[PDB]
Amino acid sequence: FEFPEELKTKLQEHINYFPKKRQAILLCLHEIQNYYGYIPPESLKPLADMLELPLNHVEGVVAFYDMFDREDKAKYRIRVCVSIVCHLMGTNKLLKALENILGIKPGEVTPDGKFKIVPVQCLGACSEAPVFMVNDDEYKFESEVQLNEILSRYT
Amino acid sequence: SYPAIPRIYAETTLNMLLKRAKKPRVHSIDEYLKDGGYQALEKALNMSPEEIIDWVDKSTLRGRGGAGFPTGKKWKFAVQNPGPRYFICNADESEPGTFKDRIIIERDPHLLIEGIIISSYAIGANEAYIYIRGEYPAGYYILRDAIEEAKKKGFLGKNILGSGFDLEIYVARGAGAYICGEETALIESLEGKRGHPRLKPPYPVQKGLWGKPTVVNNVETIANVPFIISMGWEEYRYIGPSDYAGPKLFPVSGKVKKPGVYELPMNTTLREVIFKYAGGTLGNKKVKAVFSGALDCFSSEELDIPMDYSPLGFGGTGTVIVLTEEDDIVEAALKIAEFYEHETCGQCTPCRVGCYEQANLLEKIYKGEATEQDWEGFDFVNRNIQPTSICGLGAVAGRLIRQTLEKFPEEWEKYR
Numbered sequence: 001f002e003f004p005e006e007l008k009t010k011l012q013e014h015i016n017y018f019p020k021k022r023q024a025i026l027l028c029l030h031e032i033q034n035y036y037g038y039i040p041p042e043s044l045k046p047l048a049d050m051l052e053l054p055l056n057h058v059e060g061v062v063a064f065y066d067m068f069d070r071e072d073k074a075k076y077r078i079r080v081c082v083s084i085v086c087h088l089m090g091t092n093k094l095l096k097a098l099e100n101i102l103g104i105k106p107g108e109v110t111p112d113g114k115f116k117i118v119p120v121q122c123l124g125a126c127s128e129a130p131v132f133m134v135n136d137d138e139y140k141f142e143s144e145v146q147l148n149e150i151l152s153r154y155t
Numbered sequence: 156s157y158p159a160i161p162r163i164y165a166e167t168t169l170n171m172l173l174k175r176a177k178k179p180r181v182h183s184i185d186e187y188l189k190d191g192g193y194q195a196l197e198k199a200l201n202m203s204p205e206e207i208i209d210w211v212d213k214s215t216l217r218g219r220g221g222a223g224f225p226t227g228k229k230w231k232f233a234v235q236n237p238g239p240r241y242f243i244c245n246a247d248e249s250e251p252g253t254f255k256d257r258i259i260i261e262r263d264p265h266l267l268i269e270g271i272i273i274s275s276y277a278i279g280a281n282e283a284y285i286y287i288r289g290e291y292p293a294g295y296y297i298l299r300d301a302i303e304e305a306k307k308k309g310f311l312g313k314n315i316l317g318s319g320f321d322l323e324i325y326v327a328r329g330a331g332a333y334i335c336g337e338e339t340a341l342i343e344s345l346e347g348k349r350g351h352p353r354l355k356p357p358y359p360v361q362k363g364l365w366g367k368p369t370v371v372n373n374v375e376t377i378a379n380v381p382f383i384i385s386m387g388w389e390e391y392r393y394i395g396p397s398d399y400a401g402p403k404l405f406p407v408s409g410k411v412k413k414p415g416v417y418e419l420p421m422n423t424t425l426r427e428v429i430f431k432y433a434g435g436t437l438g439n440k441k442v443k444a445v446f447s448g449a450l451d452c453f454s455s456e457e458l459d460i461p462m463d464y465s466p467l468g469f470g471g472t473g474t475v476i477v478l479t480e481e482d483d484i485v486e487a488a489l490k491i492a493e494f495y496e497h498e499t500c501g502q503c504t505p506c507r508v509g510c511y512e513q514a515n516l517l518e519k520i521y522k523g524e525a526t527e528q529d530w531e532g533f534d535f536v537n538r539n540i541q542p543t544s545i546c547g548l549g550a551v552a553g554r555l556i557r558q559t560l561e562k563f564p565e566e567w568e569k570y571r
């Protein structure tokens with residue numbers, strides 16, 4: 001496995017950011033997922049040596065943190081809040097609309113690998129319930145029409 | 156340019172923490188300075204760190220991160236131990252219904268940054284951190300840009316405002332675990348390990364980051380520091396008037412006409428928050444319950460309680476999740492149950508199995524698939540998540556659900 005120049009540079013920046021190299025693990029793993037659309041298992045070894053940590057330490061971190069996905073590859077991750085306020089305000093309507101638009105359910109990835117619905121806990125935007133993320137972007141769900149319009153910005 | 160942020164409604168009667176944060180936009184350092192920003196930092200750097208701790212202690216400012224610990228007292232504890240010392244801003248905010256902290260981060264980062272600088276100076280910390288949850292990417296980028304603005308104006312970096320004081324603020328990102336909001340788990344995450352809380356004692360104020368005296372304060376608590384120093388401790392305790400000083404942010408959500416963040420004094424009642432400020436309920440339906448995040452449950456007979464930290468007060472993080480007539484308490488309790496099932500770090504067995512069984516038994520109860528044993532087991536499990544727990548999650552994972560079983564027995568009886 002070989003990291004691309006563009007990602008290696010960003011990873012190195014994170015590693016030199018904090019006083020201790022090992023502190024950059026989460027930021028490095030966020031950057032890896034942003035580039036690939038997942039955490040490739042093969043990328044865990046060059047990352048381990050980059051932070052000066054054992055491979056099993058990095059593996060444990062990926063497994064502990066919910067945002068890091070070691071299994072499925074997806075260009076866009078639709079994090080749909082399934083917590084109390086969004087549930088009470090319309091999580092299932094948003095889930096129904098996403099199913100009508102993409103033809104996929106939570107934990108499923110579209111055949112072309114473009115989108116993946118990810119059920120997550122409180123997104124901290126409860127006043128705007130039901131809430132959903134499309135990678136870093138966060139929105140309030142209004143309707144299927146409003147959703148289809150938002151989702152068309154992702155290609 | 157920053158990633159898309161939801162347009163969270165914000166309102167204030169005090170115009171302090173939300174003086175700029177009431178507008179949904181990133182306020183630059185120029186807009187912050189225009190309002191008299193960084194004048195408190197200038198005043199603080201001419202004082203001794205001891206004087207600043209005394210003003211914070213005298214102001215009677217209490218932690219806004221749930222525990223309500225007096226901020227001044229916490230700082231006094233850390234300074235009784237030799238340095239180097241560390242200051243950490245807790246921007247993990249992951250409790251359901253809580254969204255008050257992000258609007259300070261995303262709209263007025265300089266209010267938070269100045270607060271961090273003053274607080275770091277007060278405890279002699281030359282290294283500070285902002286631990287921001289991973290689900291706030293925009294907040295992360297906004298804070299990085301704002302930190303660069305502060306350095307470029309001489310409020311951060313080396314020899315800040317010619318005082319000789321050096322400070323670096325590092326922004327760390329969380330990656331999806333509510334438990335990383337717990338101060339010891341947060342430190343573990345910052346050290347690059349899994350967010351597993353450590354057994355207390357030791358306490359972070361004596362042994363925190365790298366085993367050094369560490370002060371962990373919530374975003375909202377830190378945002379109060381520039382006001383304490385700018386106004387003075389006296390003016391600050393007079394605002395309310397309540398025995399629990401200062402402005403307070405109330406993230407109001409649920410079946411209210413106007414959900415959002417409300418900056419109100421803590422003497423304000425729960426009824427006032429819902430009806431006077433949030434604009435009542437949708438269709439004017441009767442409020443059956445109010446969930447204080449995922450911590451407490453208040454019935455319609457507890458609406459006249461104050462929003463302070465008194466024994467009969469609202470307490471917690473001031474999180475208001477409104478539930479009307481049409482909302483099923485069992486269905487709500489299930490969402491609370493599901494939250495603890497998903498967030499237990501699994502270090503403690505009664506918490507690991509307790510949070511799991513509570514959610515799984517509640518789902519069976521809710522679906523009409525529960526036996527008499529599943530019912531009797533649900534009661535047992537709810538009462539036995541606390542044993543051997545080494546952090547606050549285990550102690551409270553059954554609290555709200557127990558309150559619904561006690562305050563809404565008629566609703567549960569339908570399912571039994």
Ligand SMILES: Cc1cc2nc3c(=O)[nH]c(=O)nc-3n(C[C@H](O)[C@H](O)[C@H](O)COP(=O)(O)O)c2cc1C
Pocket residue numbers: 217218219220221222223224226245246247248249250333334335336337338339371372373374376377546547548
């Ligand atoms: C499971 C758990 C999660 C917590 N989450 C948060 C959080 O997201 N933000 C926060 O500031 N405090 C949170 N706390 C409280 C912290 O442990 C700590 O008391 C607080 O950051 C201290 O800051 P304060 O004195 O300014 O309130 C949490 C506690 C527990 C037990």
Ligand code: SF4
Pocket residue numbers: 334351352498499500501502503504506507544545546547548549550
């Ligand atoms: S009480 Fe629960 S969340 Fe806290 S350390 Fe124990 S298992 Fe983890």
Ligand code: FES
Pocket residue numbers: 081082083084085086087121122123124125126129131251252253
């Ligand atoms: S409950 Fe969904 S954003 Fe908080």
Ligand SMILES: [Cl-]
Pocket residue numbers: 165166167168177
């Ligand atoms: Cl206002």
